[PDB]
Amino acid sequence: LIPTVIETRAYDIYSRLLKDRIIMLGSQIDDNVANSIVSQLLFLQAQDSEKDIYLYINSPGGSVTAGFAIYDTIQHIKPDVQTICIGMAASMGSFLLAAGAKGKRFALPNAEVMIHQPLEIAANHILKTREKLNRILSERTGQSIEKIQKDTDRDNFLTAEEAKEYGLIDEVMVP
């Protein structure tokens, strides 16, 4: 499922999108996805430190650690990382959605968003990093930590407009 594009040079579609500073996160997040995403972010920062990056998100979520690698890289680099949810952003996918530059987090009208953080590691360290997630989510949305602690414990499916109301995105994109 990846066509070729030859300018007058052969790119598959994603590599051609990367040329325009577009990164497609279209899968479950594991370490392989994270290493690839971080790499693309580093490449694009190196090309241009002033120019916006566009990160598109269609993701069921995944590994907290891998999710955090991408997060911290988004925060480190100078360029503004816009975020755009195109199909779904659940758990760590919605966390990355909300971690886009302020004013620059978007979703298409019909995109679903879920803040539910589900669940060998010791229980106390899982709970410790969870607190870390809630604290970061509390800031980037303007909601109280109490309210985010509750909400991430349930599997609430948000509409694009609920997400905006909630503070996970800045705008719903209009045709």
Q: Scanning residues 68 to 107, which ones bind a copy of itself (CB under 8 A)?
A: 68-69, 71-73, 75-76, 86-88
Bridge partner list, 163: none
Please, which residue, 40 or 141, has the CB nearer to a copy of itself? 40
Q: Which of 80, 101, 116, 138 binds a copy of itself (CB under 8 A)?
A: 116
Q: Does 8 bind a copy of itself (CB under 8 A)?
A: yes
Active site residue 39: no
76 is catalytic: no
Tell me if 77 sits within 8 A of 41, measured CB to CB.
yes
Instruction: Give least dist CB 131 to a copy of itself, A.
Output: 12
144 contributes a contact to a copy of itself by CB under 8 A: no
Indicate the helix (H) or strand (E) that contains 12. Answer: strand 10-12
Burial class (CB in 10 A: 0-12, 13-18, 19+), 74: buried
Q: Does 49 bind a copy of itself (CB under 8 A)?
A: no
Helix (H) or strand (E) holding 75: helix 64-76
Q: Which of 50, 102, 123, 142 binds a copy of itself (CB under 8 A)?
A: 123
User: What is the three-class DSSP state of 58?
Assistant: strand
Identified binder of a copy of itself from the candidate list 49, 131, 157, 161, rule CB under 8 A: 157
- Where does 29-167 show beta strands of DSSP type E? 53-59, 81-90, 105-107, 112-114, 157-158
* Residue number, 51 or 76, with CB nearest to a copy of itself: 76
